[PDB]
Homo-oligomer: A and B are copies of this chain.
Amino acid sequence: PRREVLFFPSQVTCTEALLQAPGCPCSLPHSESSLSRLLRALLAARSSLELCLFAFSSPQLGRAVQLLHQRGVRVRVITDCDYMGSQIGLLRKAGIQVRHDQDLGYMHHKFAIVDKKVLITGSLNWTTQAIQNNRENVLIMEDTEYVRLFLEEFERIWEEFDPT
């Protein structure tokens, strides 16, 4: 019955194994960090991931989301800016549906929903700058009411930003 909080800045740790680097000799610590814990939380997804993020430029988090899409996880992404090789651009090129705001600041959430059961939500924008340098919190909660209410909010915004 998961209820955790990750505080940032993250310790810089190796994530090559975790992110299936193609093909450890590197010089980083090979222990867990706030980033590695966030990556693992995302990578435990077996069926769906909703992402509702003001900003998303972290290549480590971008890669994890790609890996999920490749695994057949149903990935849906809402961001504030259209970004138009950013991460949103790379995700979009891989076939992941991304919908978006007016890049005016209005879509300011920073949350993700894993398999309609775990809520990941924080102050943290998903950028290497913020991860490595800012004081931030991210909550990881397996809570049915919070998941339900955040899912409902997602689906309203999703339908609202429908292109067609």
Contact = CB atoms under 8 A, between A and B. Distances in A.
A150 B109 contact: no
Interface of A: 3, 5, 7, 54, 101, 105-111, 121-124, 129-130, 133-137, 139, 143, 145-146, 149-150, 153, 157
A137 B121 contact: yes
A108 B121 contact: no
Given A5-B146, A108-B130, A123-B54, A157 B137 contact: no
A130 to B, nearest CB: 7
Contacts of A145: 3
Contact of A135 (B107, B136, B139): B107
Number of copies: 2
A86 B3 CA distance: 37
Contact of A153 (B111, B137, B149): B137
Contacts of A146: 3, 5, 139
Given A108-B123, A123-B123, A150 B133 contact: no
Contacts of A129: 105
Contacts of A7: 149, 153
24 contacts: A3-B146, A5-B149, A5-B150, A7-B149, A7-B153, A105-B134, A107-B134, A107-B135, A108-B123, A108-B124, A108-B130, A108-B134, A108-B135, A108-B136, A109-B136, A111-B137, A121-B137, A121-B139, A123-B123, A135-B157, A137-B150, A137-B153, A139-B139, A139-B146
